[PDB]
Amino acid sequence: DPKVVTYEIFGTPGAVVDINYLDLDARTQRVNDVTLPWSITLSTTAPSALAHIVAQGNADHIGCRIIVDGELRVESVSTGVNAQTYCIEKSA
């Protein structure tokens, strides 16, 4: 069965952020003006993949998770004015 990778961005309900995330073709995607909380789910038949995401907007509290086949792999949370959050999983 395919590997399922989910990115989550969360922290301040209703905050608006912009996002760059890596898809499972190793291509960087851009999403602008997204409301929190937010997620996207991707899948691949490759057994191993790089995954990473960065988000930033008007939230003063913001975090990210990378979940692979239901398993939490990495988590980061930040507090600060217009804070940025970054998660990377080098072997999803």
Side-chain angles (χ1 to χ4, degrees), residues 8-56:
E8 299 183 335
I9 308 293
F10 60 85
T12 301
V16 182
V17 304
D18 307 323
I19 304 176
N20 276 109
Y21 68 86
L22 201 60
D23 76 20
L24 301 185
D25 301 321
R27 284 185 244 280
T28 297
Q29 304 293 327
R30 178 69 186 189
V31 198
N32 290 305
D33 311 306
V34 160
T35 294
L36 306 181
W38 172 96
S39 65
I40 194 173
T41 297
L42 314 167
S43 67
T44 180
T45 47
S48 295
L50 176 60
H52 65 67
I53 186 168
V54 51
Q56 180 182 16

Side-chain angles (χ1 to χ4, degrees), residues 60-83:
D60 292 351
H61 185 47
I62 193 178
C64 56
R65 283 188 283 256
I66 303 177
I67 303 136
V68 179
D69 297 326
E71 186 194 354
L72 176 58
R73 297 288 199 90
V74 287
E75 181 178 61
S76 192
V77 185
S78 295
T79 298
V81 166
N82 299 334

